[PDB]
Design a protein around this ligand. Sequence first.
Ligand SMILES: CNc1nc2ccc(C3=C(C(=O)O)CCC3)cc2s1
Length: 165
Amino acid sequence: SFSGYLKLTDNVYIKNADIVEEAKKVKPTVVVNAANVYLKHGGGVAGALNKATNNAMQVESDDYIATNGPLKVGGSCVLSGHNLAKHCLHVVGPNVNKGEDIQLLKSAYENFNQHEVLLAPLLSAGIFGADPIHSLRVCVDTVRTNVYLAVFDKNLYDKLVSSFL
Ligand SMILES: CNc1nc2ccc(C3=C(C(=O)O)CCC3)cc2s1
């Protein structure tokens, strides 16, 4: 039941909103988590989504890692969305503050194409160190399915919308 989004391109929408509140209110088929390779949900969007599941996401993630090993940078896995969504697509963008290649941000967003509709944050923003406006450009250039982007910070949201319109 997505509402209040501004359409940027044929398939990319954006809203100034807390992704945790959007997920609770909409219960989308897929919510994207901005994960790391070991699925340790310590801060940023990952910590927020995990806290909203009261750590059910972390317990399930630890079991995925013990059985399957870590993800690769640019890779993803599908796990339960618990109370936030039917599924959580955990996607690893490059941490350019740690020398990880920015080219891998395109590979990360390619994972979204397996799902027709997703609620997502911008990848590699925050502690991962990428420029969020560059991250939105890669999203627009790479994602072919319908993506509803939620951005918490009003100053960042206004900057993104100005660079697009
Ligand atoms: C409890 N809800 C939330 N906690 C956070 C923490 C960080 C963020 C981030 C960004 C943002 O959209 O402003 C970009 C970098 C990290 C978002 C949420 S929503």
